[PDB]
């Protein structure tokens, strides 16, 4: 019986109080409305209808901290209300036109969004907790602020990232996490280590999995090429190694990403999202900002996008659900006792691929009654026979290594990260600065360590923004240690408020 472990990793860097658009609080509001709330509704249905098709969901600590924030909750409420009004306005403008059906859908969507958000008391974290409680999903944690594990300069800093993540998970769910999502699936085994830039001490460092083990984590995930060598997914076939559960020397277990299921969904040439009926991500209404057009054709110009047909688009998800399950059955036939790990960035479903969440639900419903492929949580997925394996260093990023986050444009970044991590450690040992100052400084360090900054600069999704973002957290960090006034500290505490119980002791041992 082949095991299918669907793993969704929900994440977004800290945008609370740092602007709204392009990349700001609105980015978080969109995800809540298009990905998280719809996902919660799927979970509620499956529980209500007794459908047994569990999967795994990761919510990075920094994301959960924002979702549970009063300002974000109120901000989302205003966002949704405003969107509903924009939808109602579009329905009157487009009534009787080719965009009517799409306009009606928008109204219905936002009405449901406001009503659902209101019925959950605007607390998404609580709903996910409820779903896990029902057994419909397993929740896993990650690095506090999604720091790039392999490159953090100090073991105590990586420890702080990991431990703060476990603590946040406990705080929000009143349970301990056994599963852990490695940001960018970036891994580094035990062994000699030399800093990429000046700062950190060069010497033997424990493997990332060793710290995870010490933190109570029992399993994580890595990209396919870490267990089967060869080319990364930057055609990459799935060797038998990728279908086995792997146990490291530390005792930690790892599953490897299945290439086929990843490409079948993400591919720009044949991924499901490219289907012509699906809603076009890149075309927004000049006046309302809403999406009323469909992909139509992958090559098609924006001006050539045809009107969006909501009904036809969502109906199409059933077809792709069957197709996907067909692929799972072939993979299963090839490895009847293997484990198929299909890990994705959660925002892919709902935000990038609008109909993607309905697709997920369709897939789970089909898998609940599938004799060849059994949907399981990560914990169940890692049980049974395992291959003793040693993992080389790498990630699931372009090139299968660290080039995306470590490069020409990000040298200054890691430079400041290393300096800051060392200072944090020292400040923690000295213990002379006020408790509050140490906690906020720690917060600034964590925010600075977000891999999202170097990522957004290399990709070009928001280079100037990301650059200013890390420079400011760095600036705030050293200013706090060098000496800031009580009111300057409070302004930073209010602006950057994640981790109310951040523990500076973590930088010691």
Curated annotation (Swiss-Prot):
Record carries keyword Glycosyltransferase: yes
Family, as annotated: Belongs to the glycosyl hydrolase 57 family.
Biological source species: Thermus thermophilus (strain ATCC 27634 / DSM 579 / HB8)
GO terms assigned for molecular function: 1,4-alpha-glucan branching enzyme activity
Active site per database record: 184, 345
Cellular-component GO terms for this entry: extracellular region
Protein name: 1,4-alpha-glucan branching enzyme TTHA1902
Keywords in alphabetical order: Carbohydrate metabolism, Glycogen biosynthesis, Glycogen metabolism, Glycosyltransferase, Transferase
């Amino acid at each position: 019986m082949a095991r299918f472990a669907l793993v969704l990793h929900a994440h977004l860097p800290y945008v609370r109080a740092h602007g709204m658009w392009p990349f700001g609080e609105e980015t978080l509001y969109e995800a809540m409305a298009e990905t998280y709330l719809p996902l919660i509704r799927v979970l509620e249905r499956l529980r209500a209808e007794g459908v047994e098709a569990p999967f795994t969901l990761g919510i990075t600590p920094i994301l959960a901290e924002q979702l549970a924030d009063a300002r974000i909750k109120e901000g989302f409420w205003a966002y949704a209300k405003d969107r509903l009004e924009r939808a109602q306005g579009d329905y009157q403008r487009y009534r009787g036109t080719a965009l009517e059906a799409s306009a009606r859908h928008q109204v219905a969507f936002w009405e449901l969004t406001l009503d659902h958000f209101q019925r959950l008391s605007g607390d998404l974290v609580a709903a996910f907790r409820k779903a896990e409680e029902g057994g419909q999903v397993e929740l896993i944690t990650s690095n506090a602020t999604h720091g790039y594990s392999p490159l953090l300069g100090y073991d105590e800093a990586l420890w702080a990232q990991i431990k703060t993540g476990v603590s946040t998970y406990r705080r929000h769910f009143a349970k301990d996490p056994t599963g852990f999502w490695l940001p960018e699936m970036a891994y580094r085994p035990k062994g000699p280590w030399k800093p990429p830039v000046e700062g950190p001490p060069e010497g033997v460092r424990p493997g990332v999995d060793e710290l995870l083990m010490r933190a109570g984590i029992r399993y994580t995930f890595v990209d396919a090429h870490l267990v089967q060598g060869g080319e990364p997914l930057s055609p990459v076939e799935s060797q038998e190694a990728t279908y086995h559960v792997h146990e490291l020397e530390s005792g930690l277990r790892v599953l490897a990403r299945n290439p086929e299921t990843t490409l079948q969904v993400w591919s720009a040439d044949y991924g499901y999202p490219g289907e012509g009926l699906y809603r076009e991500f890149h075309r927004k209404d000049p006046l309302s900002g809403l999406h009323h057009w469909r992909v139509t054709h992958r090559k098609a110009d924006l001006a050539e996008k045809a009107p969006y047909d909501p009904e036809a688009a969502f109906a199409k998800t059933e077809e792709h659900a069957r197709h996907f399950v067909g692929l799972l059955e072939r993979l299963a036939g090839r490895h009847p006792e293997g484990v198929i790990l299909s890990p994705y960035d959660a925002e892919l479903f709902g935000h990038w691929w609008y109909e993607g969440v309905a697709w997920l639900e369709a897939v789970l419903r089909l898998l609940a009654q599938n004799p060849k492929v059994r949907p399981v949580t990560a914990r169940e997925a890692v049980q049974g026979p395992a291959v003793r394996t040693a993992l080389p260093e790498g990630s699931w990023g372009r090139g299968g290594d660290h080039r995306v986050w470590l490069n020409e444009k990000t040298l200054d970044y890691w430079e400041k990260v290393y300096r800051a991590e060392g200072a944090m450690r020292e400040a923690a040992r000295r213990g002379v600065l006020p408790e509050g100052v140490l906690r906020q400084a720690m917060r600034e360090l964590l925010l600075l360590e977000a891999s999202d900054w170097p990522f957004l600069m290399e990709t070009g999704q928001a280079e100037a923004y990301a650059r200013e973002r890390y420079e400011e957290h760095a600036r705030a960090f050293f200013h706090l240690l060098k000496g800031a006034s009580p009111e300057e500290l409070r302004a930073l505490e209010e602006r950057d408020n994640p981790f109310p119980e951040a523990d500076p002791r973590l930088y010691l041992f």
